[PDB]
Design a protein around this ligand. Structure first.
Ligand SMILES: [Cl-]
Length: 138
């Protein structure tokens, strides 16, 4: 019911102990989902489930600096399913983003962008029905 792409402001950026929660449902025959934690035009953390990359499902993570993608971090474990509801939780830790999906740890992504307090927007996009997006301090 939120419109996608959705922008969630992160006031004053992110900080360790901040938990972001995204609830939605994957569309039928989805191709992609993306979370973009942005520092201005840079993407500090791109989290991109791909449903059909050469007939495999993979999650691709990266950082975009001055309009240039860096070295991808790719992961075989793929917990999403077309058609099904999901919960993504992104926990900011002192040295990485920690991602859990449906209450199961998925991956960690080391901070490349180190001005965490300038990562002030989260863009949520792709082939989902988005139910809610929020954050809290744990
Ligand atoms: Cl930085």
């Amino acid at each position: 019911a939120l419109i996608v792409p959705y922008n969630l402001p992160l006031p004053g950026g992110v900080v360790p102990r901040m938990l972001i929660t995204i609830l939605g449902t994957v569309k039928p025959n989805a191709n992609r989902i993306a979370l973009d934690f942005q520092r201005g035009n840079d993407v500090a953390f791109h989290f991109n489930p791909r449903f059909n990359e050469n007939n495999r499902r993979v999650i691709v993570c990266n950082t975009k600096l001055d309009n240039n993608w860096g070295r991808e971090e790719r992961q075989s474990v793929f917990p999403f399913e077309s058609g099904k509801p999901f919960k993504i939780q992104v926990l900011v830790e002192p040295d990485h983003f920690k991602v859990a999906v449906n209450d199961a740890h998925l991956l960690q992504y080391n901070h490349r962008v180190k001005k965490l307090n300038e990562i002030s927007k989260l863009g949520i996009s792709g082939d989902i029905d988005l139910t809610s997006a929020s954050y809290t301090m744990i």
